[PDB]
Design a protein around this nucleic acid. Structure first.
Ligand SMILES: [Mg+2]
Ligand SMILES: [Mg+2]
Ligand SMILES: [Mg+2]
Ligand SMILES: [Mg+2]
Ligand SMILES: [Mg+2]
Ligand SMILES: [Mg+2]
Ligand SMILES: [Mg+2]
Ligand SMILES: [Mg+2]
Ligand SMILES: [Mg+2]
Ligand SMILES: [Mg+2]
Ligand SMILES: [Mg+2]
Ligand SMILES: [Mg+2]
Ligand SMILES: [Mg+2]
Lengths: 214, 91, 97, 25, 97, 127, 197
RNA sequence: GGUGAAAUUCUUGGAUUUAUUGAAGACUAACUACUGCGAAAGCAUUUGCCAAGGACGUUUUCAUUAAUCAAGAACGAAAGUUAGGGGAUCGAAGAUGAUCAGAUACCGUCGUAGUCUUAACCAUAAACUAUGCCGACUAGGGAUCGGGUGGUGUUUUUUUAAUGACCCACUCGGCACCUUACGAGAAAUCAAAGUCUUUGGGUUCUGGGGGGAGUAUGGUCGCAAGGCUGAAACUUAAAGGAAUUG
């Protein structure tokens, strides 16, 4: 027999506290004996959990949140935000024929030395009492919406560290800004960010992690 | 008058060495004996002294270039990638 | 739009071309503006900057060699530095751009 | 007999036919 | 003779569209000529819904459903009995059902 | 309460893969395929082989600690069929039937922005 | 003479005595007379400058690279040649590099290199066209030209010599362990024949 | 893995499958349409730059400057050729595995050339709408793209103004469609393929039964493959088009 389960310790998962309860679940790895101990091996791990698990309500069923573990405080794993991305069926549900799709990306820097790329997907909307049945744009409104989005998505960042970027990401306050600024150009129905991906992580800043782990 | 139809400068070679070799030599010897624009003084006065040595007959400026051209394509690419690395480190 | 401003000076204002006449115009204080080509040698570029610092004359840096400067003037010869002796109908002096 | 293979069989025939003529000079 | 005024596809004013590949056999198809079915399937079943219901946390969580746009070639569509070959009068009809 | 896993069901044709992980995906728990339970090479994608696979996953899953999973149904994807195999969906029902809990059922079949020309030739595969 | 690449005579100032120090560099593409060349740890990333391999970014094109810090140039010295830099190991400082032959060497981060590519590239693209241009090329290098074939010789002069037809008569792939006087042909050859799959 | 089923191939030297990180090259999904632009071939991620273009508007300007075109030219999918670079996937040649009487075919696994780029060549496609271009006139309807015009019309922008989005009614230009057969056609069908024995708006190109044969020869273009121009001898009573019935 070999049964490498017996040499495992069953650590725990803790989210950042910029959210609701952080009892995500149980990590299962190994015993941290000599010969390439597990104290350092678990440093480079990313976990995938839905946002509605970390917020309770069922309105956030999409936009699953990735958390990157940072330290092991004995029996634990302390995680920071790693990325946000929608679930697959949510893109499929919002993508429909007879509507323009507008997408925009900027690689933007926060107040911290954070380098991370943000997207934004927009779907043109049929207005009420309309008899036209495709609601396409004019291919300059697409560049007008994209230019407005790129200005909005650059002004919300370059303050807004990831400690407070997640506090604007959850309440859809970016979507409010896009609709209140683009609605003069074209009616829109599904405004979303749909993707947060982290590119370059700076120096660790152990103090900044502790703020989100009460 | 047009003295030769296609051999050009390679008419010095007569009929020997093969048409393809003379033609390959023609492309590189036209570059080798051309006159290039001086990036410094702006004049078209750069002529090869030796392979890799390009000298302006005014302003007395010598640049190290290719064997038969002032600048080779792989080296402009090298110069473009060196500078792109430089601003991002300097950023 | 800067070639357009420089071209209008040629047909309406007063100018001098080259270096021996630009320095001599800086020397006697009859230069409003001098434009230096991009590939002008730095030793000549720094002496023009010093001469225009003493005479209190603005300096524009053309984004082009002596070939393009002479074309922007409307000539068919390389121009290293052009000294605007008097503006024409253009706004080249008012807008340093 | 596909027309495009009549074309191909003729080109092999023509390649032979000017090969033998260049020989026969 | 001509079988269809829209020869076999949907192109009048292009001269070329793009090639796409058949789901069933990977055949290169003109994108306007391919038979496009919006393949709609529920995420689980018409039967296993309750079997997942008893064993699911988050009661009636989402009940999702999978989407995918499939492209069929002409031979595979007929062999898979998708387009269901029609009469001379009835083939003019373009209605989805 | 419940120890969430990730089910990560991979269902191609000729075989189905029921590979459960930890909650982070990295650590493997009880990967049993439909091909190891039967020897016919024709039903290795069938519902019964995957059912035998899914049942044997739950047995190896128990006495370990995992009691709920996250379901990630997947086909080959990329430049391939993208329609999940006949064994994949039976594996989910067989997994729930064993008693283990379910949460966040999702499809994770990869979809490209079309590239890397699909195998088969311009005339396709014709038999 | 004897080298395809041009040479740059670069004059420095002696830090410890009032005199000038003339160096002999292999000129890089674009380097001109009157260019200021910078050599050191903190020198700027520009063509012609001498920087340690750890001082430059990944993807940097370098030439005249040192195998060991202080041997004054070993790698990528022929005309048109260069070294690619493909990553660092700052702990126990090494640097992975790509050599002109494609070999992937690991060199210390303190080894120096000149930024850019050796000048004179494309020299071998011209056919020499005739024996006398090979005569003058090797008049300035060494006595290696012309080359009588071994099969054209007698058995006394070569392993390939002799026979009533000109032929090698035994496998021309020779083992690495074979002694001197036997290595004539394809020494230690992994494979032979035209490179084609 | 792959298959109707297998074999070949890899695998306790850990395959496949699960996670993190990258590299390389190619492509631009879903949105994407009986939609757009372009002379055609063609053209679909993002922004910046450069030059161009159609339409619409005009109570601006010139005043026949035009139409079509031998000769003569520019562009011209893919494949292919030369020399570099690139060479992920796919993949003429070839290897191997099957089935089969045989398979040097289909199916399966590899895999050189190629697929990508630059500088040149080639100049061919069912390059098709198998429908030359310019001009006039002849029938009804809706939908749509772009420009414009008019509404005491809706929609949030601050409660409503402007402008943008939408609705309605017109207009022009465009890709198209639906019905009908006035008329046409051998018919299929066609708003042109109509205004043709009641035959004539201008103009260019091409065909004269089927084969031989796009062959032979000559000339010319190309490195080559080949392109363009292009017969005759001889042979033959049909070949062929559209539709009806079986
Ligand atoms: Mg038929
Ligand atoms: Mg076509
Ligand atoms: Mg010899
Ligand atoms: Mg002898
Ligand atoms: Mg001997
Ligand atoms: Mg796209
Ligand atoms: Mg469009
Ligand atoms: Mg002609
Ligand atoms: Mg033709
Ligand atoms: Mg035709
Ligand atoms: Mg149109
Ligand atoms: Mg006749
Ligand atoms: Mg005839």
């Amino acid at each position: 027999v070999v049964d490498p389960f017996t040499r495992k310790e069953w650590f725990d998962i803790k989210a950042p506290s910029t959210f609701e309860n952080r009892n995500v679940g149980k990590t299962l790895v190994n015993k941290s004996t000599g010969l390439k101990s597990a104290s350092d091996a678990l440093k480079g791990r990313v976990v995938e959990v839905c946002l509605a698990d970390l917020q309770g309500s069922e309105d956030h069923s999409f936009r699953k949140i990735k958390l990157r573990v940072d330290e092991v405080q004995g029996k634990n794993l302390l995680t920071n935000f790693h990325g946000m991305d929608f679930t697959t069926d949510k893109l499929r549900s919002m993508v429909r024929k007879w509507q323009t799709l507008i997408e925009a990306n900027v690689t933007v820097k926060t107040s911290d030395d954070y380098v991370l790329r943000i997207f934004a997907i927009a779907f043109t909307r049929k207005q009420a009492n309309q008899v036209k049945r495709h609601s396409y744009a004019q291919s300059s409104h697409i560049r007008a919406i994209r230019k407005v989005i790129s200005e909005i998505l650059t002004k919300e960042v370059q303050g807004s560290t990831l400690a407070q970027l997640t506090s604007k990401l959850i309440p859809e306050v970016i979507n409010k800004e896009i609709e209140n600024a683009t609605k003069d150009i074209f009616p829109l129905q599904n405004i979303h960010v749909r993707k947060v991906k982290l590119l370059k992580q700076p120096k660790f800043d152990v103090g900044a992690l502790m703020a989100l782990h009460g | 008058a047009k003295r030769t139809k296609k051999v050009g400068i390679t008419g010095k070679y007569g009929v020997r060495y093969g048409s393809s070799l003379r033609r390959q030599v023609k492309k590189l010897e036209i570059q080798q004996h051309a006159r290039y624009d001086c990036s410094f003084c702006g004049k078209k006065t750069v002529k090869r002294g030796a392979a890799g040595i390009w000298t302006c007959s005014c302003c007395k400026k010598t640049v190290a270039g290719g064997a038969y051209t002032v600048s080779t394509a792989a080296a402009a690419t090298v110069r473009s990638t060196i500078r792109r690395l430089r601003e991002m480190v300097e950023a | 739009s800067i070639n357009q401003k420089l071209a209008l000076v040629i047909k309406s204002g007063k100018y001098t071309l080259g270096y021996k006449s630009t320095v001599k115009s800086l020397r006697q204080g009859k230069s409003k503006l001098i434009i230096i080509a991009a590939n002008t040698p730095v030793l000549r570029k720094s002496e023009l900057e010093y001469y225009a610092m003493l005479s209190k004359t603005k300096v524009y840096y053309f984004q082009g060699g002596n070939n393009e400067l002479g074309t922007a003037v409307g000539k068919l010869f390389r121009v290293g530095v052009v000294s605007i002796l008097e503006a024409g109908d253009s706004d080249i002096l008012t807008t340093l751009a | 007999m596909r027309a495009k293979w009549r074309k191909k069989r003729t080109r092999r025939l023509k390649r032979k036919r000017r090969k033998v003529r260049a020989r026969s000079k | 003779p001509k079988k269809r005024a829209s020869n076999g596809r949907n192109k009048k004013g292009r001269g070329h569209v793009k090639p796409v590949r058949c789901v069933n056999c990977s055949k290169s198809i003109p994108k306007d000529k391919a038979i496009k079915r919006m393949a709609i399937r529920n995420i689980v079943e018409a039967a296993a819904v309750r079997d997942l219901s008893e064993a699911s946390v988050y009661p009636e969580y989402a009940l999702p459903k999978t989407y995918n746009k499939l492209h069929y070639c002409v031979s595979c569509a007929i062999h898979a009995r998708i387009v269901r070959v029609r009469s001379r009068e009835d083939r003019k009809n373009r209605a989805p059902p | 309460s419940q120890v969430f896993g990730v089910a990560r069901i991979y269902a191609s044709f000729n075989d189905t893969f029921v590979h459960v992980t930890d909650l982070s995906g990295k650590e493997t728990i009880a990967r049993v395929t439909g091909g190891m339970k039967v020897k016919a090479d024709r039903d290795e994608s069938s519902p019964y082989a995957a059912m035998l696979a899914a049942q044997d996953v739950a047995a190896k899953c128990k006495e370990v600690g995992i009691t709920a999973v996250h379901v990630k149904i997947r086909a080959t994807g990329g430049t391939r069929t993208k329609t999940p195999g006949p064994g994949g969906q039976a594996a989910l029902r067989a997994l729930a039937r064993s008693g283990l809990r379910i949460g966040r059922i999702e499809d994770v079949t990869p979809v490209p922005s079309d590239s890397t020309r699909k195998k088969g030739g311009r005339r396709g595969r014709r038999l | 003479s004897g080298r395809g690449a041009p040479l740059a005579k670069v004059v420095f100032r002696d830090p410890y005595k009032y005199r000038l120090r003339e160096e002999i560099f292999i000129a890089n593409e674009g380097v001109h007379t009157g260019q200021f060349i910078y050599a050191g740890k903190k020198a700027s990333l520009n063509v012609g400058n001498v920087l340690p391999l750890g001082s430059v970014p990944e993807g940097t094109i370098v030439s005249n690279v040192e195998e060991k810090p202080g041997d004054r140039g070993a790698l990528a010295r022929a005309s048109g040649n260069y070294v690619i830099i493909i990553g660092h190991n700052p702990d126990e400082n090494k640097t992975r590099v790509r050599l002109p032959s494609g070999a992937k060497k690991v060199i210390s981060s303190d080894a120096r290199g000149v930024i850019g590519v050796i000048a004179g590239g494309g020299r071998v693209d011209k056919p020499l066209l005739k024996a006398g241009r090979a005569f003058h090329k090797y008049r300035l290098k060494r006595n290696s030209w012309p080359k009588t074939r071994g099969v054209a010789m007698n058995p006394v002069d070569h392993p390939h010599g002799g026979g009533n037809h000109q032929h090698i008569g035994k496998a021309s792939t020779i083992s690495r362990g074979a002694v001197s006087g036997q290595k004539a042909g394809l020494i230690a050859a992994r494979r032979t024949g035209l490179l084609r799959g």
